[PDB]
Design a protein around this ligand. Structure first.
Ligand SMILES: [Cl-]
Ligand SMILES: [Cl-]
Ligand SMILES: [Cl-]
Ligand SMILES: [Cl-]
Length: 280
């Protein structure tokens, strides 16, 4: 049924039109905190900000701001934190958020450099013996092991709160093969990655929300959240064909602006949900 809708949109060539309708219908809420002068260097892109109502607040005392939003999908029963790729001055804030929100997994959808442009800071350690200390937020981060596969890498990180000496294992799920331009021709590897994140236990409601990012935290990150949420809704709804991807995306857009940045990402999302549903 979704596949009938897909073939019809493809045949009529109206992805751009449907995508522009989503842009026009999307929620508009204030982002006053993100736009305060004191937060200018905490934002990677001046045009991508978290709404005040859904922003993640840091708990330490001087400035609570991080460019990150809680996407709480009530019907699907899953929450996600979508955030920009950390900046050189916000890596301590990023790991403070992971600690305070009790997240178990981090999903990264970009390479640190793509087409010779930096998309995010090197915010985790690449060598076991070269741990990172974030002196502003008093956290230590150590690479324990990594499992490098052809299309993604999963890293076992140890995050230590240096104040209390408590440690937690964080799983870093890094999809390394999104194309430099456009979307993947096939959703197969993206879906395999999505199911590996699920299989790891990182999305269990016993943990805090998974932290998802790319460079701005809206495009590829939106595709991941949209596909994961729609697949959940299909497994729960009495009639799985009732899941309307455009409606789900507009729901997500109540929590963070700009999710899904191109008509091609919208088409890819439909394609990933259709193929993933067959798998389940
Ligand atoms: Cl200010
Ligand atoms: Cl990388
Ligand atoms: Cl729906
Ligand atoms: Cl947009």
């Amino acid at each position: 049924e979704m596949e009938k809708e897909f073939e019809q949109i493809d045949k009529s060539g109206s992805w751009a039109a449907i995508y522009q309708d989503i842009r026009h219908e999307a929620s508009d809420f204030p982002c006053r905190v993100a736009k305060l002068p004191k937060n200018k260097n905490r934002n990677r892109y001046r045009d991508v900000s978290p709404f005040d109502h859904s922003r993640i607040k840091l708990h330490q005392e001087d400035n609570d701001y991080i460019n990150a939003s809680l996407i709480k999908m009530e019907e699907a029963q899953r929450s996600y934190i979508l955030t920009q790729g950390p900046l050189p001055n916000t890596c301590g804030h990023f790991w403070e958020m992971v600690w305070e929100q009790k997240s178990r997994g981090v999903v990264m959808l970009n390479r640190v450099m793509e087409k010779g442009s930096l998309k995010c800071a090197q915010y985790w350690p690449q060598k076991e013996e070269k741990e990172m200390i974030f002196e502003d937020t008093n956290l230590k981060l150590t690479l324990i092991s990594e499992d490098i596969k052809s299309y993604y890498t999963v890293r076992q990180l140890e995050l230590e709160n240096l104040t209390t000496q408590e440690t937690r294992e964080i799983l870093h799920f890094h999809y390394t093969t999104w194309p430099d331009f456009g979307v993947p021709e096939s959703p197969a590897s993206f879906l395999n990655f999505l199911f590996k994140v699920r299989e790891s236990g990182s999305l269990s409601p016993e943990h805090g929300p998974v932290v998802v990012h790319c460079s701005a935290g809206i495009g590829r990150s939106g595709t991941y959240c949209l596909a994961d949420t729609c697949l959940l809704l299909m497994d729960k709804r009495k009639d799985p064909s009732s899941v309307d991807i455009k409606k789900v995306l507009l729901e997500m857009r109540k929590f963070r602006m700009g999710l899904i940045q191109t008509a091609d990402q919208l088409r890819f999302s439909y394609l990933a949900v259709i193929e993933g549903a067959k798998f389940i």
